[PDB]
Amino acid sequence: MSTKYPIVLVHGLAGFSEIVGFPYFYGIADALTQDGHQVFTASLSAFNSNEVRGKQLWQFVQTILQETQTKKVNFIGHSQGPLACRYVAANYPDSVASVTSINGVNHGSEIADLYRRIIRKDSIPEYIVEKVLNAFGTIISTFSGHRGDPQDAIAALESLTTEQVTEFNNKYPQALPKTPCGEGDEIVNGVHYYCFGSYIQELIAGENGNLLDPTHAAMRVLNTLFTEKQNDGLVGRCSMRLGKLIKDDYAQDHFDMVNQVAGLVSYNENIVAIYTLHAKYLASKQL
Ligand SMILES: [Ca+2]
Ligand SMILES: [Cl-]
């Protein structure tokens, strides 16, 4: 069961593989190709708007469609990636077979909102300020070797705020939940939409691998700062919703759902198998 249309993995941290030394979707393109699927990876700019990432993505896809002569692509995006995918699907539906959003910031990130308030010097209790700053420094240091300037992250997190995703969502409403925390239509203008998510949970005798992953400790701290108690450290469970829900109750953090860092995840969960099973599902729908 390989897909009719090529899979395009989409993320919003262009430069990751060059700076960090391994792919953002850790182990995923390899496993999908072992299974017979055509796989591309689109790495889009972190420091740009969602619209501008969507335009970069279209240029990427137009380019691969010329060569595969396949007409359409199946997008699999994580975090900011789905917003760029949504842009291409809304604009160029005849070129998009599906959009699959994995822990997408589809309605905004409470942590991005909080970081913005910090940079604006709103009155935030200092203990909250330190939790955010220290988690970001730990994440940024784990991947890049430097903790960064806290104004380093601004250009990136701005496009993930509830404000800026709301504005995006007004222009590109396709497949968005109607009800608070609902599902969207599976098919809009011929494009199939699917979503996956996860949230941090205290269950038994994990977390195993993740005990060695500094990003997981950062996510666990960030998790405590949200009004939405079910979240993945960066995005609240309901904010991830787009199109048809597949599964959103994995006990995983935001990074874990891309098998990071370096395959350190909770509970010896096989994250790559989430992606390979989903590819077979897409193929099963003649995509
Ligand atoms: Ca992890
Ligand atoms: Cl990458």
Numbering used by the authors: 1 to 287
Reproduce the article's own wording on this structure:
Some lipase enzymes are effective catalysts for biodiesel synthesis and have many potential advantages over traditional base or acid catalyzed transesterification. The lipase from Proteus mirabilis is a particularly promising catalyst for biodiesel synthesis as it produces high yields of methyl esters even in the presence of large amounts of water and expresses very well in Escherichia coli. However, since the Proteus mirabilis lipase is only moderately stable and methanol tolerant, these properties need to be improved before the enzyme can be used industrially. PML was shown to be tolerant to short-chain alcohols such as MeOH and EtOH and to catalyze the synthesis of fatty acid methyl esters (biodiesel) in the presence of high concentration of water.
The structure of Dieselzyme 4 was determined by x-ray crystallography to examine the effects of the mutations on the PML structure. Besides the introduced disulfide bond discussed above, 11 new mutations arose from in vitro evolution. Mutation of leucine to isoleucine at position 64 provides more interactions with side-chains F40 and F60, possibly improving packing to stabilize helix α2. Similarly, the R33T mutation that arose after the final round of error-prone PCR (see Dieselzyme 4) forms new H-bond interactions between the threonine hydroxyl and the backbone carbonyls from A29 and D30. Loop mutations G202E, K208N, and G266S and are located close to the Ca2+ binding site which is essential for lipase stability and activity. The most striking change in the loop is a direct result of the G202E mutation. The introduced glutamate side chain at position 202 is positioned ~4 Å from R220 in an orientation that could form a new salt-bridge which may provide stability in the low dielectric methanol environment. In order to make this potential new salt-bridge, the helical region between residues 203 and 207 seen in wild-type PML partially unravels and may increase flexibility of the loop region to allow new interactions to occur. The evolved PML enzyme, Dieselzyme 4, catalyzes efficient synthesis of biodiesel even in the presence of a high concentration of water and has better methanol tolerance and heat stability than the top industrially used lipase from B. cepacia.
